[PDB]
Each structure stands twice: as structure tokens, then as C-alpha cells.
Design a binder for this molecule. Sequence first.
Ligand SMILES: Nc1ncnc2c1ncn2[C@@H]1O[C@H](COP(=O)(O)OP(=O)(O)OP(O)(O)=S)[C@@H](O)[C@H]1O
Ligand SMILES: Nc1ncnc2c1ncn2[C@@H]1O[C@H](COP(=O)(O)OP(=O)(O)OP(O)(O)=S)[C@@H](O)[C@H]1O
Ligand SMILES: [Mg+2]
Lengths: 242, 242
Amino acid sequence: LQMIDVHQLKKSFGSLEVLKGINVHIREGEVVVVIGPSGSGKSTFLRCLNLLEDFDEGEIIIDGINLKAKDTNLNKVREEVGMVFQRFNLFPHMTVLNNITLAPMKVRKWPREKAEAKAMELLDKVGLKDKAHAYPDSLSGGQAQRVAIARALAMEPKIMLFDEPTSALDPEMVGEVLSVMKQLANEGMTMVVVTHEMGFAREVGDRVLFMDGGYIIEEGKPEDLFDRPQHERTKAFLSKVF
Amino acid sequence: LQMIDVHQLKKSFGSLEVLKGINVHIREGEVVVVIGPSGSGKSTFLRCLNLLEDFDEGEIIIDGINLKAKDTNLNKVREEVGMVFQRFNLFPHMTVLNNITLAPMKVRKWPREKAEAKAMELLDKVGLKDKAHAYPDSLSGGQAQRVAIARALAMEPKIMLFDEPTSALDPEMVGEVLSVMKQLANEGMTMVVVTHEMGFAREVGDRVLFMDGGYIIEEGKPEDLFDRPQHERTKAFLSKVF
Ligand SMILES: Nc1ncnc2c1ncn2[C@@H]1O[C@H](COP(=O)(O)OP(=O)(O)OP(O)(O)=S)[C@@H](O)[C@H]1O
Ligand SMILES: Nc1ncnc2c1ncn2[C@@H]1O[C@H](COP(=O)(O)OP(=O)(O)OP(O)(O)=S)[C@@H](O)[C@H]1O
Ligand SMILES: [Mg+2]
């Protein structure tokens, strides 16, 4: 309940209150999986967590610091949270290596040799050291998404956010990215993963949160949630998804 | 030999000669379509035009300025050349309006409302003003790629490069992207378009360059190159694609 703390979170886009009061508390090293239909506020939720969107009411605490406290450095938090999106993760005009090294050099003021040493180490980890000097256009979707992960890991964050990282990919490219994320969980990374891939959720997630219409409607262990859902809306959603 | 001027352009990656003597001279307002097999150097070529890659031998002159002359402001050339890639054109972490205004604000130091009025009219022209405050991942491929053109146009370039802008799109999304590109061609923009979209090439294209193995093997008017190719490599390539 220590790494991410969310109390009565609400958000509105004028008329549409997209997050209608949500509560979640994520411990250090916990993999939490977010599921639910389109328009639930799943991405908005992740954005608030990543300081990409401000909220209308409630509280967000990350690593024991408040996002709306006057004294708190938001830029310092920004670099402790990583985020991988469904698309557009890479700079197409830069090599794979320079994608990864850009922020660690620009933000954390690392020297080139140091940053590239760690970038090659992460490319090794994802199975793409042989693509260091390649351009994003040369990469398949599964390879591009694995570079996005490596990009995010180079800042060495405390939390990794994943917004449907495999949703835009062909089925032959999905498990590629899921195994990197799977491996990332095995190394004690606090992860929030928005996904429709339920086999990942059950295999990897510590808790599953079912979001619908701006609420977290049901939550709990993957086995508990998938096998024995209690809420009609959870049942309805699970009757048509993977 | 006005807008783009290339003489015996050569580029290697190690012992791999990727461009082997490119000579091409693009007039102002000319729309050049580039076609050819994978590994032809089409993307490398466009990168050289866009100052994203250095070259081993030869000369490149964008609008009367030599990219290797001593007194050359490279950044001032960079800002007059726009580029749309196959994928990764957008920042997923910021809104559509912000994607477009980022560069004119940083590079041209425009105030926010100035840049935004320009972005809004650009979104209008590509038929997407309603998506101004939306995030990239809410967009279709067709939409995303139109915003990618809007981003590029916000810098007010005189050269627009397109590296397979519709390749990674579902076929129904291909149409409305080529409509924007056509409008851009019809308005006098100097365009280099790497594309295997024949209808586009025939309609708004002035010339077609057939690249293969680091050379421009054959060139000419689209009708002429498409319907009566002179070189057997061009014929063979046309037979397997169109
Ligand atoms: N920047 C924005 N401006 C206005 N409305 C928005 C914005 N972002 C999201 N919305 C609204 O919020 C809903 C989208 O939900 P999201 O917050 O994107 O979460 P989500 O559940 O991931 O959505 P999907 O489509 O399932 S991935 C839509 O109905 C939008 O109208
Ligand atoms: N940064 C790099 N390092 C090493 N090799 C490269 C690099 N960039 C390109 N190449 C190689 O150069 C050759 C031609 O590159 P491109 O310009 O991408 O060709 P292309 O015609 O665009 O091919 P595609 O895949 O149809 S877009 C390919 O064999 C690449 O493997
Ligand atoms: Mg979403």
C-alpha cells in the first residue's frame, strides 16, 4: 500500500466525469493489472499516475510523496515513473540506441559512454542488442514495443506503467512483449498494466482491477476475479474478452 | 537545379555500401515518388535529405545551401525540411494540439495562442479539429498519420518528405491520408514520397524514381515508368508489386 496511493480520484473532461471516485493502493513490487471495456478511464487513470494529466479531486501519492503538495518536485517524480503506450513510443528519426540514451543523458545528466553501456545492457535483456544502430522503421511491432520498454527502463524507474502495449500488435508479436513484461515482474518491479490479454493477467498479476464507467467495480486475485466474478458487469465483460 | 540537389551521393554502413551514387535534382513544387525493393536505400536517402544521417561521398544542396559548406547553419535547413515516417510520428504522452505546437514553440519561440491558432487551422485542413484535445492512442491509423502531417506542416516547411506514410495502415485508412498529401501536392509543395501507392503516383506525381541496390536504376513520368519501363529490373520489380 506504499508505492502508489490513490484516494477518491476524480477527473472530468468538462461534462464527462471519466474517473468517478477511484481508490487503489499499490505496494512496492506489486504487479497490478487493469481490465475493462473502452471508455472506462483506464488510460486517463495511468496518465494521472504519470503526471500527464491533472485531476479534479482526490489524492495521488507516489513513493510517499503527494502530487499536489506545494513543496513537491513533480519533475523528480516524472522520472521515477516509466510509461509504455500502445503506439508512438519511439523517435523514428533516431537509432534504437539513441532512443534509449536520450533521456538518461538529457534528464539525469549521464555521460554518453555510461548511458550507452546501460542501453546495450537493456537491449541485451530484451533480445535486441543486434538492433542498437537500426532505425525504428527497420523494427517489427514486437521489436519496437520491446525497445519502448528498454527506453523506459533506462531511466531506471521505480514504477512501470503499461497502457495496452500489445493491443496494436499482430498476435504473432504479442507474447514477445509479454515475456519481457513477465520477466520484469519476476524482478520485483512495481507494475500497473492495462491489458486485454487475460493470460498475462492470470499468469503475472498480483491483483486485477476491473474498471467500468469510471469506477473500479470489482477487484482481487486473478484466479478469484476471472474464475469466480461476483458483479454482473464483470461477468458481462469477461463473457466477451481476450 | 533549385529545391533539392544531389550529386553522386554515397553512404555506407561498414563494408555495406547502401547508396552507391545517387544523382537527383528536384525542382521547387515538384512531387517525386520513390519506389523499389527493401534495402534499396530509400529511407537512408530521405534521412540524408532531412539531415538525420551523414554521407560518405557526394553533395547535397537544399534550396541553394550545401549541407557540408563551412558557413552552413544546419538547424536552419532542418527547420525548412519536414518529414513523415511510416510509424512513430506522434508523442503518445501529450494531446494532438500539443504534438503540433511543440516544435514551433521551441524552435520559432511562438507564444502559446499563436502556435495553437496555427495548429487549429492545420487540424481543420486535415479534417481533425475535433481531435485537438484527444490523445494519439484514441486515434485511428488514418487519423494519427494525418496529425503527423499536421505536425510537420506547423513548422511551415518548403520540403515535405514522406517515408511510406501509408504502409503500416489498414487499407481503409490509406485513403484519407493520401487525400491530404494530394492537397499538399496541389498547393505547390516540393514533395519526395516513398510509396508503392500507384494511384497516388499517377495522379499527383511528376516523376517516379526506381531505386534498387543503392542506385536509381530508372526514372521518368509515372505513366511512362509504370506502363512502359525500359530497364528489366524495373519491369521485374513492377511485376511482383503492381
Ligand atoms: N483528452 C480528452 N478530452 C476529452 N475527453 C477525453 C479525453 N481523454 C479521454 N476522454 C474521454 O474519456 C473516455 C475514454 O476513456 P479513457 O480515459 O481513454 O480510458 P480507457 O478505458 O482506456 O478508454 P479505451 O478507449 O477503453 S483504451 C472517452 O469517452 C472520452 O470522451
Ligand atoms: N543505421 C544502420 N546501420 C546498419 N545498417 C543499416 C542502417 N540503416 C540502414 N541499414 C541497411 O541499409 C540497407 C538499406 O536501408 P534502407 O534505406 O532502410 O532501405 P529501404 O529501401 O528503405 O528498405 P525498406 O525496408 O523497403 S523501407 C538495408 O539493408 C539496411 O539493413
Ligand atoms: Mg486506453
